[PDB]
Amino acid sequence: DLADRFAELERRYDARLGVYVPATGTTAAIEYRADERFAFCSTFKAPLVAAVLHQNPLTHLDKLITYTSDDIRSISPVAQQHVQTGMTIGQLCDAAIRYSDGTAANLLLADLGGPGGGTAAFTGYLRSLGDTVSRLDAEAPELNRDPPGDERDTTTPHAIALVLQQLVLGNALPPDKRALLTDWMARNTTGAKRIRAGFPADWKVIDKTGTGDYGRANDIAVVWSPTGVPYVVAVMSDRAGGGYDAEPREALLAEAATCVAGVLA
């Protein structure tokens, strides 16, 4: 039994686990703690890139953004190398998704603009997609640090799955922008030990990960079966019992995904 398996994983990893897979043609929704709040962590960067793509003509991708030393305040594998040259909006989107570059995502929030350094406009973009649950209140590094249970900077597996479904499978974005987002997630470099690890090699997986304090580890994905049937998979976790420095456990997400894949196969 699924729920029994997910409960067993919680005990194994001293963790709280949330899972959602939306219903399809022939499968019921899979849900475990799906309406409980979990920190976004870096998973917000996927709808962030969608918001920026949606807000602007496509050639806004070619606009050069400049930044400085005091902008590097979080893990930023790409942006830390380009302070002198700047980065174009397209390079920022690529880095935010594929390398989970924190400076890149902060710069994209600023591009979106408005109150809260773009966090209010980000939240408004989610509201436009019918998500009345999620909220973004801070940028990096603060957004990964809220105490367990705090509602700041949170989504739920259910909410983020429905958002991702609209972005990748539905009509939230025009086809050209949808393809840009989908391809960046398809080329993600940070997800090999999470949802990807739980699905057989002949399933396609695109994803966006997040990791935070209090043992936070998330992954949101769209997967396609070998015959092209898509499913959206959101898996979220934290480990409050280990305190602020609790180690994130990727293996919990890989095992949860393996269980989901077993049901979807």
Short mmCIF file of C-alpha atoms in Angstrom, two decimals:
data_model
loop_
_atom_site.label_atom_id
_atom_site.label_comp_id
_atom_site.label_asym_id
_atom_site.label_seq_id
_atom_site.Cartn_x
_atom_site.Cartn_y
_atom_site.Cartn_z
CA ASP A 1 0.00 0.00 0.00
CA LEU A 2 1.31 3.41 -1.11
CA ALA A 3 0.49 5.37 2.01
CA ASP A 4 2.06 2.64 4.12
CA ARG A 5 5.22 2.82 1.98
CA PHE A 6 5.40 6.61 2.28
CA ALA A 7 4.89 6.40 6.08
CA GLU A 8 7.70 3.80 6.24
CA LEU A 9 10.00 6.20 4.36
CA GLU A 10 9.20 8.96 6.84
CA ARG A 11 10.31 6.73 9.70
CA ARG A 12 13.45 5.60 7.81
CA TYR A 13 14.63 9.12 7.13
CA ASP A 14 13.15 10.81 10.24
CA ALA A 15 11.35 13.01 7.78
CA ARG A 16 8.06 14.49 6.73
CA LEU A 17 7.23 13.56 3.13
CA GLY A 18 4.69 15.08 0.77
CA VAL A 19 3.72 13.63 -2.58
CA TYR A 20 1.25 14.63 -5.29
CA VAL A 21 0.58 13.25 -8.76
CA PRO A 22 -2.53 14.76 -10.42
CA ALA A 23 -5.24 12.46 -11.75
CA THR A 24 -5.12 11.48 -15.41
CA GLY A 25 -7.29 9.62 -17.91
CA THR A 26 -7.00 6.35 -16.06
CA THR A 27 -5.16 7.04 -12.79
CA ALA A 28 -6.47 8.53 -9.58
CA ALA A 29 -4.44 11.27 -7.97
CA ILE A 30 -1.64 10.06 -5.75
CA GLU A 31 -1.60 12.11 -2.58
CA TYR A 32 0.31 11.92 0.69
CA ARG A 33 0.46 15.01 2.90
CA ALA A 34 -0.31 16.72 -0.40
CA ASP A 35 -2.13 19.69 1.17
CA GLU A 36 0.46 20.29 3.88
CA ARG A 37 2.79 23.27 3.42
CA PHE A 38 6.48 22.69 2.60
CA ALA A 39 9.05 25.34 1.77
CA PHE A 40 9.42 25.98 -1.97
CA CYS A 41 13.16 26.28 -1.70
CA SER A 42 14.51 26.49 -5.25
CA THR A 43 11.51 24.83 -6.87
CA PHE A 44 10.04 28.36 -7.21
CA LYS A 45 12.51 29.03 -10.02
CA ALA A 46 10.46 27.00 -12.50
CA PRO A 47 7.31 29.17 -12.21
CA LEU A 48 9.60 32.22 -11.88
CA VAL A 49 11.07 31.57 -15.32
CA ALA A 50 7.53 31.03 -16.63
CA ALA A 51 6.45 34.38 -15.17
CA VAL A 52 9.37 36.22 -16.79
CA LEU A 53 8.80 34.50 -20.12
CA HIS A 54 5.09 35.25 -19.96
CA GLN A 55 5.59 38.91 -19.02
CA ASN A 56 7.90 39.85 -21.93
CA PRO A 57 8.45 39.43 -25.65
CA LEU A 58 10.73 36.50 -26.42
CA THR A 59 13.55 38.77 -27.43
CA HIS A 60 13.73 40.06 -23.82
CA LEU A 61 15.85 36.88 -23.47
CA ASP A 62 18.64 38.85 -25.17
CA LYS A 63 18.66 41.75 -22.70
CA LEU A 64 21.93 42.03 -20.74
CA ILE A 65 21.58 42.30 -16.98
CA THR A 66 24.47 43.72 -14.96
CA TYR A 67 25.16 42.91 -11.32
CA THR A 68 27.92 43.29 -8.72
CA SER A 69 29.89 41.58 -5.88
CA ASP A 70 27.21 42.26 -3.28
CA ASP A 71 24.63 40.40 -5.42
CA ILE A 72 26.33 37.03 -4.81
CA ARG A 73 24.65 35.93 -1.58
CA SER A 74 23.76 32.25 -2.29
CA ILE A 75 24.97 29.19 -4.27
CA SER A 76 25.42 30.65 -7.80
CA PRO A 77 27.57 28.34 -9.93
CA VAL A 78 27.08 30.33 -13.12
CA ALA A 79 26.48 33.92 -12.00
CA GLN A 80 29.52 34.05 -9.75
CA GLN A 81 31.58 33.74 -12.99
CA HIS A 82 29.88 36.62 -14.90
CA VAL A 83 29.84 39.71 -12.61
CA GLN A 84 32.02 41.70 -15.01
CA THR A 85 30.27 40.71 -18.21
CA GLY A 86 26.72 40.47 -16.92
CA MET A 87 24.26 37.80 -18.04
CA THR A 88 21.40 38.00 -20.49
CA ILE A 89 17.86 37.21 -19.27
CA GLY A 90 18.04 33.92 -21.22
CA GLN A 91 21.33 32.99 -19.55
CA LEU A 92 19.74 33.84 -16.17
CA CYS A 93 16.74 31.58 -16.88
CA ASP A 94 19.06 28.76 -18.00
CA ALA A 95 21.25 29.08 -14.88
CA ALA A 96 18.26 29.41 -12.51
CA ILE A 97 16.72 26.19 -13.79
CA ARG A 98 19.67 24.00 -14.74
CA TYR A 99 22.17 24.92 -12.02
CA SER A 100 19.70 26.33 -9.48
CA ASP A 101 21.67 29.53 -9.53
CA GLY A 102 20.48 31.68 -6.62
CA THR A 103 21.80 34.99 -7.87
CA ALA A 104 20.23 34.34 -11.25
CA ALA A 105 16.82 33.73 -9.62
CA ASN A 106 17.20 36.87 -7.46
CA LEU A 107 17.96 38.88 -10.60
CA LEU A 108 14.92 37.40 -12.35
CA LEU A 109 12.72 38.36 -9.40
CA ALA A 110 14.05 41.92 -9.76
CA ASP A 111 13.30 41.79 -13.49
CA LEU A 112 9.70 40.80 -12.75
CA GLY A 113 9.75 43.78 -10.39
CA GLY A 114 7.30 45.42 -8.02
CA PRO A 115 7.08 45.14 -4.21
CA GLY A 116 9.16 42.71 -2.22
CA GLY A 117 11.89 42.61 -4.89
CA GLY A 118 9.54 40.78 -7.26
CA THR A 119 8.20 38.29 -4.72
CA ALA A 120 4.72 39.87 -4.74
CA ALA A 121 4.55 39.71 -8.56
CA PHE A 122 5.76 36.11 -8.45
CA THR A 123 2.97 35.23 -6.04
CA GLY A 124 0.50 37.11 -8.28
CA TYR A 125 1.61 35.01 -11.24
CA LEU A 126 0.72 31.89 -9.24
CA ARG A 127 -2.64 33.40 -8.33
CA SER A 128 -3.29 33.91 -12.07
CA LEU A 129 -2.89 30.14 -12.46
CA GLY A 130 -5.52 29.48 -9.76
CA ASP A 131 -3.00 28.76 -6.99
CA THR A 132 -4.44 30.43 -3.90
CA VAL A 133 -2.14 28.49 -1.55
CA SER A 134 1.50 29.22 -2.38
CA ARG A 135 3.38 32.31 -1.29
CA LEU A 136 6.84 33.75 -1.80
CA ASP A 137 8.00 36.26 0.77
CA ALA A 138 11.79 36.42 0.50
CA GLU A 139 14.54 35.87 -2.05
CA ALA A 140 17.78 33.96 -1.58
CA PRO A 141 19.21 33.16 0.88
CA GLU A 142 16.36 33.94 3.24
CA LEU A 143 13.64 31.87 1.53
CA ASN A 144 15.17 28.50 2.52
CA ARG A 145 15.43 29.36 6.22
CA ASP A 146 11.92 29.76 7.61
CA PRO A 147 11.27 27.64 10.71
CA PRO A 148 9.43 24.37 10.19
CA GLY A 149 5.68 25.09 10.15
CA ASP A 150 6.07 28.76 9.19
CA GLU A 151 3.88 29.61 6.18
CA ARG A 152 6.31 32.07 4.59
CA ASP A 153 7.90 30.88 1.34
CA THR A 154 5.70 27.78 1.14
CA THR A 155 3.76 25.78 -1.37
CA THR A 156 2.14 22.34 -1.14
CA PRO A 157 2.77 19.26 -3.29
CA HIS A 158 -0.79 19.63 -4.62
CA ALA A 159 -0.48 23.32 -5.45
CA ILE A 160 2.91 23.18 -7.13
CA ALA A 161 1.94 20.08 -9.13
CA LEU A 162 -1.12 21.85 -10.56
CA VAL A 163 1.00 24.90 -11.39
CA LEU A 164 3.64 22.79 -13.14
CA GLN A 165 0.95 20.89 -15.00
CA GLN A 166 -0.42 24.14 -16.45
CA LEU A 167 3.05 25.41 -17.35
CA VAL A 168 4.36 22.29 -19.13
CA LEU A 169 1.28 20.34 -20.21
CA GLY A 170 -1.45 23.00 -20.33
CA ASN A 171 -1.85 26.41 -21.93
CA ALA A 172 -0.40 28.82 -19.38
CA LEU A 173 2.33 29.73 -21.83
CA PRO A 174 2.33 30.07 -25.58
CA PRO A 175 3.98 27.09 -27.29
CA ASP A 176 7.33 28.84 -27.91
CA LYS A 177 7.74 29.93 -24.30
CA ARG A 178 6.44 26.57 -23.06
CA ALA A 179 9.17 24.86 -25.10
CA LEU A 180 11.90 27.08 -23.59
CA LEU A 181 10.81 26.21 -20.04
CA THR A 182 10.38 22.51 -20.84
CA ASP A 183 13.83 22.25 -22.45
CA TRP A 184 15.60 23.98 -19.57
CA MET A 185 13.96 21.54 -17.13
CA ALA A 186 14.83 18.65 -19.46
CA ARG A 187 18.49 19.69 -19.32
CA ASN A 188 18.52 20.14 -15.54
CA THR A 189 21.86 19.11 -13.97
CA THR A 190 20.80 18.88 -10.32
CA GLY A 191 18.13 16.16 -10.31
CA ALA A 192 19.85 12.87 -11.03
CA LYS A 193 19.43 11.45 -7.53
CA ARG A 194 15.80 12.47 -7.02
CA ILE A 195 12.68 11.80 -9.15
CA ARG A 196 14.90 10.77 -12.11
CA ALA A 197 16.43 8.03 -9.98
CA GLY A 198 13.01 6.45 -9.37
CA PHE A 199 11.85 6.19 -13.00
CA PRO A 200 13.13 3.64 -15.52
CA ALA A 201 15.51 4.98 -18.19
CA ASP A 202 12.92 4.73 -20.97
CA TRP A 203 10.73 7.32 -19.18
CA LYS A 204 11.54 10.94 -19.97
CA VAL A 205 12.02 13.15 -16.92
CA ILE A 206 12.23 16.95 -16.69
CA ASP A 207 12.54 18.50 -13.24
CA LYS A 208 13.45 21.31 -10.86
CA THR A 209 14.96 20.55 -7.45
CA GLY A 210 15.16 22.49 -4.22
CA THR A 211 17.17 22.03 -1.05
CA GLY A 212 17.07 24.03 2.19
CA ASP A 213 17.68 24.12 5.91
CA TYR A 214 15.95 21.75 8.34
CA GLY A 215 16.75 18.89 5.97
CA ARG A 216 14.60 20.25 3.14
CA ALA A 217 14.74 18.36 -0.15
CA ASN A 218 12.22 18.78 -2.96
CA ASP A 219 11.80 17.84 -6.60
CA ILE A 220 9.04 18.72 -9.07
CA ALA A 221 8.93 16.91 -12.40
CA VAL A 222 6.99 16.08 -15.48
CA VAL A 223 7.60 12.54 -16.67
CA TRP A 224 6.54 10.78 -19.86
CA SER A 225 6.02 7.08 -20.23
CA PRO A 226 7.69 5.20 -23.09
CA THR A 227 4.46 5.72 -25.08
CA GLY A 228 4.30 9.47 -24.36
CA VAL A 229 1.73 9.59 -21.55
CA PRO A 230 2.67 12.44 -19.14
CA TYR A 231 2.35 12.63 -15.38
CA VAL A 232 3.30 15.44 -13.02
CA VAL A 233 5.19 14.39 -9.87
CA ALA A 234 5.79 16.66 -6.86
CA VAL A 235 7.81 15.32 -3.93
CA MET A 236 8.67 17.49 -0.92
CA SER A 237 10.41 16.70 2.36
CA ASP A 238 11.87 18.14 5.56
CA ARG A 239 13.51 16.84 8.71
CA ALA A 240 12.59 19.22 11.56
CA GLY A 241 13.81 16.69 14.10
CA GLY A 242 17.40 17.38 13.09
CA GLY A 243 17.10 21.15 13.56
CA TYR A 244 18.46 23.83 11.22
CA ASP A 245 21.48 21.79 10.16
CA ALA A 246 19.54 18.55 9.48
CA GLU A 247 20.99 16.93 6.35
CA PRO A 248 18.72 16.86 3.31
CA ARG A 249 18.20 13.27 2.17
CA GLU A 250 17.90 12.80 -1.60
CA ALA A 251 17.42 9.08 -1.21
CA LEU A 252 14.05 9.69 0.43
CA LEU A 253 12.88 11.38 -2.81
CA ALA A 254 14.38 8.67 -5.01
CA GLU A 255 12.58 5.96 -3.01
CA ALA A 256 9.29 7.91 -2.99
CA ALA A 257 9.59 8.35 -6.79
CA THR A 258 10.39 4.64 -7.24
CA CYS A 259 7.15 3.86 -5.43
CA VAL A 260 5.20 6.29 -7.62
CA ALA A 261 6.82 4.88 -10.81
CA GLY A 262 5.88 1.36 -9.72
CA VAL A 263 2.22 2.43 -9.61
CA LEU A 264 2.36 4.36 -12.90
CA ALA A 265 4.15 1.55 -14.83
#
